[model samples]
Target: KREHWATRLGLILAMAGNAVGLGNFLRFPVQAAENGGGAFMIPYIIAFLLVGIPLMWIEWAMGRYGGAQGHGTTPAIFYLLWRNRFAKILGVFGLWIPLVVAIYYVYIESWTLGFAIKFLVGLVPEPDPDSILRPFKEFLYSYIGVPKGDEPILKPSLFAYIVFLITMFINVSILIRGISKGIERFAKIAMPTLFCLAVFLVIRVFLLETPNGTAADGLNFLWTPDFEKLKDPGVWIAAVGQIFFTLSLGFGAIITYASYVRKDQDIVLSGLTAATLNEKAEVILGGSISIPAAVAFFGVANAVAIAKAGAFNLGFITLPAIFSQTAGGTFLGFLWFFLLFFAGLTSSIAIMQPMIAFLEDELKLSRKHAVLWTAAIVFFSAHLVMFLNKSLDEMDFWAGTIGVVFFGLTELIIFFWIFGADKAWEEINRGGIIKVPRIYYYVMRYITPAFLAVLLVVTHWTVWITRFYIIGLFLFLTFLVFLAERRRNH
Candidate 1:
């Protein structure tokens, strides 16, 4: 049977591969460029420290324990912490959230695939401030194979859904192949491809000199924190939330992936390495490379316009469009989306693994049966998202932002608080390649959870006090429902 990642390098690549996905490629750079310019990086770093790192450590430590027992993440951790059969159901959330996320995630991933094809054929064009987006928007809403009215051959409308299904098929097929051959090997190729593309983009952007701006502006946008933005509670919440989401915590994916790590590996170091490398990759390479390249090539004003038009369309639409007009358009555009597809594939594998593992270990299902059944379920259920196309924006908003926060908070509370931080810390420190300082114990023990709780409260308060009252009310309602459900069922 194919086993877990054979080497630490493979594990790190796999984890990094998960962390550096669409969020890093598309959202991070644009958000960094738009919100605080040079100031975003400050709270970003702070958020990473307070929220990202500690949570990562907690998840990985939990995963190590779970993997040792050969159970999937949710059941393994729940069994270790509480020994409650009922709690094992909570593991289903791990499987469910990722399934939903991957469904939509693949939808978006298809956009990159579509754009890549366009770029390859020399058909991807630059965005005219007024006209470029219409073509792109039309493409998103239509089917792939059929061309829309009077459009040129292959520029078919609504190819997105087709692309989504195709990408889903490939992702599911690879995941079904098992981890070492499928997931680990895929990461080995994808992660390096992502890094190389990022570095290449960075080097290309750095070589150019602009009259009004320097590469330093891009660095400042990601590295320097704007103090003024901190005073706005909204900024703080958004920054914290993004950092949390960016790390991909709370949905059980990290825990699931970590379950594959070796016993002697330091979960702390692994978590820290994964979190830190991801941020550095995003801010240093992804954010720094892509945003500056866009701005320098298109001008900051045009670049900002591109961002606002698409909102979260930076990587798929904006970067490809900009690169298509640049000097090395063809190669760079291919690298950009290739990196994105690679990142998405790694994450998708990690997402699917726990479910596959669950069947193999818990239900005694053969790996082949497990893989095929899970893929079939995921394919059918994913269309529910497509059916909600009218409410797709709202769905995306809730799931992407609020859902991530809720999951992050829950993971932290369960791991550090309910599981007992001291025990968790001991597990983390038990057998390690590198020694973590005592400070990590303090952070993991008290500081981290406390910060998350405070942020959660603050977020609730802001939503209630502001026009986002619906979110506040929904949160309260959900809390009550959760309490009542747990009380009755557990």
Candidate 2:
């Protein structure tokens, strides 16, 4: 029998934990600052309404409906929903995206863990008090195994691998306990703690007196919408991508998590609550902390440069520099990285679950057996990510970025277009506490699909051939699992 959430609050917090990930803490602030700052939120809010909320509800309904039928993974779920052989093949992307993402994501999560320890142990070397950037850069390079000039390119750090193992151990330990016992219980603690730390940091950020001026200037940069940039298509595209990234919509984790909801539960209300909480973490807490702190220390021009340096660069490199300069730097830095560690841990646990659920539901394995087999696969695949140069970037671009959007578009078409909107709408509203307006019936049927189609077309034009090997290998491995299951059944 499928497990159900233990409590309503547990379910919502777990859902929020799944959605509120590293992207909320790292990516959102950078995207907002670099895209159009305050001007970005106009399209951002628009995209959330048009795409984010609709897709979220659709995934939740699909998952809960699939669960009632005793299916957890996307392939089984899709086959049941669409009743076609092709559905299973298409559904492989759902498995592929998260599995590949988790492999590299664990490595990134280890960085946060390592940094937290570094700060706690006071291992981070004191930089020039006048220029905090040098020591921060040195620490990052040392941690990441970036060699100095004249030194040959070094192997993956032994310390980094140790930290990676620690992260994976924590994730698997929690997941092996099953949903209600493992995931929901941890979320109940972690989600509250995450918020508390974030709020404390937010208060500290605004309280700082920097050379540039008050934190109000940073808030102005974030909230004072630049209406003129609304005319730019790039702004709208970035907003849509941010909404998708931050909401965890395109990833298969949401579907798997929703699959555990009780049959008579109110998904409409649950979905909105999770989305709202994620947004608060992203916009209010995340937005308030990093960008403002960056602006407070360095002027707007330097802050923009740091924002453009990518999410990890901004979070690990730039923020560490800022923290080093601030009063009570060590304790505050510990809190900062620990906050990220909490966010990363929650999301990584969710990411690892879809594959485990697939094994348990489709292959009929016990939770321990499923986790063991899943870990074996992740272990080998992740080693490839660790050793290869530029391979992580390739995997992320193809699987994390492109593959997720494709899955989202495909699922919308299957549900709204192929399954018939009237039937899908009925499924959505079945146990909904909030009545979905009848107008969304038309919106899902037409507007949402059209928007996704445009997004896919625009995004598809960019490609690098190097990504295909990762995609092909994942598909081959998935096919092997399917064959193994088929043989066992016969």
Candidate 3:
């Protein structure tokens, strides 16, 4: 079968599609604000070179290796690791987690589509700066209603249901067309549009009145890195976590996309390019645009105000509200959300593709049938999450934060450490088409893994000593059982 990418452009767009998303617009700004405005970029650049870039190469090389072997990530990594039964178990977990994550992820994607539509149709009303946050907080708590001393005011509204369904449809429909046609085409169009709009917004921000209520403050907020906030552990944790999560690392998105490449492709180069573009969007473009715009409009203090008003709600809630108040706010607002819709669409393709491919390859289902069932499963699962109580949010927090970090660490360790970094170096440096700088070799082999391990440990440090003991005990027992099985086999 001709399973190769339809074109090189398609492969690049598809990979970039996976890279760009809410992280570019919503999460990146919120993380930047949370990690001390400009100070955040320091760790961000560090992680980009040390962790993000190297991991990108690791996934690419592994994907190339796996594609040559003609298998998905689990099967591919399992076969690569001596066909070890224990390794197979870990690989299976890796595959299963992405499928699970895609469900919730698609649901979140629906929000972008739904909100984008609302902004387009003029349904989203502007809010006062004083109380701009109320609507956003209301949406987050859409699971609940105004309680009169623990009594529900009303059932879940029909509006929320309609928004949910429409979003689900947009996500499912594109996925049905398969990657070469639907996902790749949309990525090429949408990503460029998003970039252009971002640059336009940056230009607009520079023209705005300064935060001091006189001249431009864009340079102060964006270019000036404030290190005072770096002293906080919270800043460190948030920066590390955002760098990993924003890139969609350890989410199986890369593994899934990489699985589609033909044997002849240079995955290392592909992965590096994708990660670099993603960081450029996040740090240079995304971070630069969103923060400066806020500062230019509301001054440095108001920067914190907007952030406190909404964490990741900047794009959907705060930006829309702010744009509605600006001159040509309506048109700018439209462009902003429209670009966001494209970003969400690209991410949706990647998130859903893994499960879709798994079903098609493993179960031999038709593409249409696989997409339909996949969408339905994610649709129901996501609704349940939206309806979750406070405890559910906690579960989501750990699953998203710690679970993601753990998963990424597993992949890096397996590929670079266990699989032999020298082998990875050769794979990455292969093809002889373009010269890869030598620094990539050292970073990929040693620095990347060490950086990831430290970040992962730092992230879970609160739980590490405790989690390790429990996991260690189980692993110790697992060794005993394995030894017993070996004796029996002998």
Candidate 4:
């Protein structure tokens, strides 16, 4: 029998912890601050109601039904949803995308954890004048082992390797405990801690007086409406992209999380509850902390430039230095990075869950052994990404960005089309708290899939080694799926 979530409280709290990702702080604010402000936010909310909600309900509704039949990972779920011989094989995507994303995303998770530790130890220098950012940027670059125009040596600094090693240990410790004690218990504590830490940082950011710019100015620069930019298709596309990323619509994590819930529980309102919490964190807290703080230290012009170039720099480079420069800012710096780790740590495990379920359920590995093998595979793969600076973005597209749209399209079509919308709708509202207003029925059945197809155009059209690794990963997983089927047949 599958382990189940212990309570309604634990399930939503865990789900929200997964939902409030590192992107909420970094990706969102930069995306909002640039390209005419999230006037695109209009597109974001629309996409959420029409696209994110239906998909959440679909993944949840289907997950419980699948769990009732004794399957948690996508291959088994897809096989049940569609009755073709090819169905299970195609479903390797569920196992594949999550593991691929986890390898690299966890690396970023380690960066935040690594920074918080360094900040605590006082190894990070206080930000100084006359070329303030360059020093900080160099520190980050050296910390991550980014080449300073030296030969492209593939070595992680001794410090970087140790930090990443401990991060791996932390995740494994929680995961080996199983769903009831591991995933569920940790989330109850971390999600609330993340909220409070974020509140303090957002509050401190609002109160700062840096003499260069105001935090409120960053807020307006980011929050201000640029109605004219709304006409650009890219803005709408960017808007919807963020909607999926923030809500985790296309990723298989939600499907796996939903699988652990009791069959008769209220997925409708529970899904809505997590969705609302994620959006509030992104807009109210995420938008306020980084963007405003950057503007406070560097002014709107420079902040916009950094945003245009990329968002990660703002979080990794700019925001870290801002607090270090202010009075009593050291504690604020440690608090900020640690909150990011808490947020990222939850996400790291959620992304890993589907694969963990696969190893235990299909291959029949014991929990500790299953987790150990998963870590070995992921840690080995991450070195390829760590050395080749460009490989991170490459895998992100294949696994995180485009791969999500690919899987989501398959999920939507399988549920509403092959399974029949009328029938799927029945299951969706079966354990309802709020009945999932019927108008969304039309949207989920038709409109949301249409938007998913539109988002499918977002792709990077990679190296043979990177392609070799990604393709090799998928093929290996497909082989495992095939072997599982053969064992059952015999």
Error of 2 at 352 (Å): 0.9
lDDT accuracy of residue 320 in candidate 3: 60
CA deviation > 4 Å runs, candidate 2? 128-130, 147-154, 459-469, 484-489
The lDDT of each candidate is: 0.66, 0.83, 0.65, 0.83
lDDT of 4: 0.83
Candidate 1 at 47: error in angstroms?
1.3
Question: Which whole-number lDDT from 0 to 100 does residue 304 have in model 3?
Answer: 68
TM-score of every model?
Answer: 0.83, 0.95, 0.84, 0.96
- Of 2 and 3, the candidate ahead on TM-score is 2
Candidate 1: pairs in clash: 39-225, 39-226, 42-225, 142-158, 143-158, 143-159, 144-159
Alpha carbon deviation, residue 14, candidate 3 (Å): 1.2
Question: Backbone clashes in each candidate structure, one number apiece?
Answer: 7, 0, 2, 1
- Angstrom error of the Cα, residue 345, model 2: value is 0.7
The numbered model that scores best in TM-score is 4
Q: In candidate 4, which residue pairs clash?
A: 38-41
lDDT of 2 by residue, 210-251 (tens): 777667788888888888999998888788888887888777
lDDT of 1 by residue, 104-214 (tens): 666667667766676667665445443654554444434333234443223324556676767877887778767667777788888777788778878877865556565
Note each model's CA RMSD in angstroms: 6.4, 2.7, 5.9, 1.9
Instruction: Return the candidate ranking by TM-score, descending.
Output: 4, 2, 3, 1
Q: If both were scored by lDDT, which would come out higher, candidate 1 or candidate 4?
A: 4
